[PDB]
Design a protein around this ligand. Structure first.
Ligand SMILES: [Ca+2]
Ligand SMILES: [Ca+2]
Length: 269
């Protein structure tokens, strides 16, 4: 039996799938700890930038979880992603312990822009700016990639890098009450929010697990961007990003929530 995690229905993905928008032909890169082979995922390709872990398989679990929120397959098992037809690429920039260099992350962004990815989902964050990182962000952006990044889980009134950069779309996390989750960073640079508490998704070992974080919120927005892209094939990264914000549901303060909660139905219309 397939179940629809609360976050997926919160962003109204099913309403968009009922109009035929599934993310088909949109190339999405998940920059994280890898993506493990799973019966509810279709991994098209990828690269590892982690010395020591030449494979794209995930030894951590995080990347596999992120990937399932974006594109868990629409079938009779497991869960359902926001864009179940998106072409998923595993870009391993973090090792099994969950860390890696700004250098590795930069290489993964370069890869994305060299491989014609439409959306890049970045799970990582840093309280400190990085010129290396910033440059990679801008380079992917000018190669047409929409870079989506997590605001961070410090609960601080300022957001992490690279989400803070102008060219990155910064995503914060909400709870089932449509309030900002306590750990969600907010403030200047925040663009939008999405579900980030008790998010059930695909997990290595052919199973499913529930996690919390701004990094669980991010993939909801990465997936909504693939629906808009499918609907409007000629739109650029900037056009998609502004449309998401323009159609998001206001939740109160833009300081805490940016444009509001992403609404995939409203955006993929
Ligand atoms: Ca499924
Ligand atoms: Ca930003």
């Amino acid at each position: 039996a397939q179940s629809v995690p609360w976050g997926i229905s919160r962003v109204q993905a099913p309403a968009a799938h009922n109009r035929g928008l599934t993310g088909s032909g949109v190339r999405v890169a998940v920059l994280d700890t890898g993506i493990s082979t799973h019966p509810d995922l279709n991994i098209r390709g990828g690269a590892s930038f982690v010395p020591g872990e030449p494979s794209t398989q995930d030894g951590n679990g995080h990347g596999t979880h992120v990937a399932g929120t974006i594109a868990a397959l629409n079938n009779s098992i497991g869960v359902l992603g926001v864009a179940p037809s998106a072409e998923l690429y595993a870009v391993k920039v973090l090792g099994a312990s969950g860390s890696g260099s700004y250098s590795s992350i930069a290489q993964g962004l370069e890869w994305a822009g060299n491989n014609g990815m439409h959306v890049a989902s970045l799970s990582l964050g840093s309280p400190s700016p990085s010129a290396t990182l910033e440059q990679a962000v801008n380079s992917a952006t000018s190669r047409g990639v929409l870079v989506v990044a997590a605001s961070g889980n410090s609960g601080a009134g300022s957001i992490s890098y690279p989400a803070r950069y102008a060219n990155a779309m910064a995503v914060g996390a909400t709870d089932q009450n449509n309030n900002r989750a306590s750990f969600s960073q907010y403030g200047a640079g925040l663009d939008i929010v999405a579900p980030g508490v008790n998010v059930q998704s695909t997990y290595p070992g052919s199973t499913y697990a529930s996690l919390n974080g701004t990094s669980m919120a991010t993939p909801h927005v990465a997936g909504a961007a693939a629906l808009v892209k499918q609907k409007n094939p000629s739109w650029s990264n900037v056009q998609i990003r502004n449309h998401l914000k323009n159609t998001a549901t206001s939740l109160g303060s833009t300081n805490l929530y940016g444009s509001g909660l992403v609404n995939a139905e409203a955006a993929a219309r």
